[PDB]
């Protein structure tokens, strides 16, 4: 339709923003513990999928918790300590989150540059309708 | 009459595009007020109903926020650009049609 380009770019921007927000939240909760109701904090990731309308935009179905084992730290003085006196610290890969943020920023800038070019082309298109 | 009927659809499309532009401007200006819900209108249904005030409905939130605001900047910007381009196209079509109707008189 020559106008689904805007939809594709907007979906890409929204997905990149979601992924960046997830990475930022993980970085903020890198060294947290004992969230609500006492359950240990676990990191989360996002999964990108394409919308087969062929070629289509990107979407994020749901946020998936990481299955990597939590860090078990010996500290009996914490009420969260089990019979072995261990507390469950969250699994956060700082380098992984930095790389994810870098990738999200680069994809966002590429998509905004594509939007700029297509907007210029579409503005120039209407000059022939007169 | 006939002259008004030949241009009614384009004129109403232009007017609805202007109203949707105003809605988008309002809900991008209120981007920081907590408790404010995003607003927009169903363009196709509105245009069909008017060709046969203005009905508006809330937007589905994208990500939660503690304050309560539910406006997404990139989505609003894309919608703004799309509506602006379609308004420009409608104006061009109306101008060309009027130019042809004027030219037929010579």
């Amino acid at each position: 339709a020559l106008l689904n380009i805007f939809d594709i770019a907007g979906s890409a921007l929204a997905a990149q923003s979601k992924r960046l927000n997830v990475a930022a939240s993980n970085l903020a909760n890198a060294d947290s513990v004992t969230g609500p109701d006492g359950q240990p904090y676990r990191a989360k990731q996002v999964v990108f999928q394409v919308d087969a309308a062929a070629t289509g935009g990107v979407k994020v179905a749901s946020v998936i918790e990481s299955q990597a084992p939590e860090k078990l730290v010996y500290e009996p003085g914490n009420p969260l300590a089990d019979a072995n006196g261990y507390v469950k610290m969250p699994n956060v890969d700082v380098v992984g989150e930095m790389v994810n943020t870098m990738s999200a920023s680069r994809s966002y800038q590429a998509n905004i540059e594509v939007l700029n070019t297509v907007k210029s082309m579409m503005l120039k298109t209407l000059t022939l309708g007169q | 009459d006939r002259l008004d009927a030949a241009l009614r659809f384009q004129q109403e499309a232009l007017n609805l595009r202007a109203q949707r532009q105003e809605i988008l401007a309002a809900n991008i200006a209120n981007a920081d007020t907590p408790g404010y819900q995003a607003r927009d209108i169903d363009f196709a249904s509105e245009l069909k109903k008017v060709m046969v005030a203005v009905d508006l409905l809330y937007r589905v939130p994208d990500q939660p926020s503690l304050d309560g605001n539910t406006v997404d900047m990139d989505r609003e910007r894309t919608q703004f650009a799309d509506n602006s381009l379609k308004y420009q196209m409608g104006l061009t079509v109306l101008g060309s049609q009027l130019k042809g109707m004027m030219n037929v008189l010579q």
Binding site: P36, D37 | L57, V60, D62, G68, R75
Partner: peptide, 21 residues
């Protein structure tokens, strides 16, 4: 349903409980 679509009713208000009630 899909984010960014049109809905006839507002979403429930957001809250961030520090501790569960």
């Amino acid at each position: 349903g899909v984010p960014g679509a049109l809905s006839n009713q507002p979403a429930p208000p957001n809250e961030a409980p520090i501790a569960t009630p």
